[PDB]
């Protein structure tokens, strides 16, 4: 599949024509750039030490996201019958890739707690790990089924 491709810029460092022009009316329209975003801040933020700890844990979070992406792109596609879930069917946070990447509404109470995210990030990471574990269980079931496949019928067709 596709790895992470999000840009990095705070509110005070918008690259558009105006500070609020990042969402729309930016020069990216002239270049046909598909960039889109919508603010969704948390209830509160941690201290400087908490910020540094979150930055350190972001590496592990990205590694887990990459592992989940690799599992989803490999196990489903290799079966030649599981890749039928399109972007709308596999919509992120209930919105397709057109709208999922244009907003951060996934920060609601489902994976995080809509609260200081120092531990909410870890909780969401644990939830994603559980989802990936379920996907791995499904992949193991598919492997056992393939073991059931290529059964005694794989031998000769008789008189051999």
């Amino acid at each position: 599949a596709s790895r992470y491709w999000v840009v990095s810029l705070p509110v005070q460092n918008s690259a558009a024509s105006v500070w609020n022009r990042l969402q729309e009316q930016i020069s990216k329209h002239s270049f046909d750039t598909p960039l889109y975003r919508f603010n969704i801040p948390n209830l509160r933020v941690g201290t400087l030490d908490s910020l540094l700890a979150l930055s350190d844990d972001l590496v592990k979070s990205n590694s887990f996201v990459e592992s989940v992406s690799h599992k989803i792109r490999r196990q489903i596609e290799e079966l030649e019958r599981v890749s039928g879930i399109e972007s709308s069917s596999l919509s992120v946070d209930g919105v397709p890739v057109d709208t999922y990447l244009t907003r951060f509404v996934w920060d609601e109470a489902k994976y995080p707690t809509m609260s200081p995210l120092r531990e909410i990030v870890d909780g969401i990471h644990t939830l994603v790990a559980k989802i990936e574990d379920d996907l791995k269980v499904r992949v193991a079931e598919y492997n056992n089924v393939r073991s059931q496949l290529n059964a005694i019928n794989r031998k000769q067709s008789g008189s051999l």
Partner: protein, 71 residues
């Protein structure tokens, strides 16, 4: 036949779990927006970046625009 069904029905649940993982990745990107905001700005979460999969030319133009905060 059971293996084919699992690749079509159980693996349909696997594809649903893949969509859930995509939702989790969207949440991770939302968290990373605030992480970058804290890293390169004040503590409260506030970001004006964007997330997409653009071409090389578009990314180069975005980098040229944002060179005021280059890495």
């Amino acid at each position: 036949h059971d293996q084919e069904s699992l690749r079509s029905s159980l693996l349909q649940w696997c594809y649903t779990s893949y969509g859930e993982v995509f939702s989790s990745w969207m949440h991770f990107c939302a968290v990373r927006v605030f992480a970058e905001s804290i890293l390169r700005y004040g503590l409260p979460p506030s970001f004006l970046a964007c997330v997409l999969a653009p071409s090389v030319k578009g990314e180069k133009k975005v980098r040229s625009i944002l060179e005021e905060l280059c890495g």
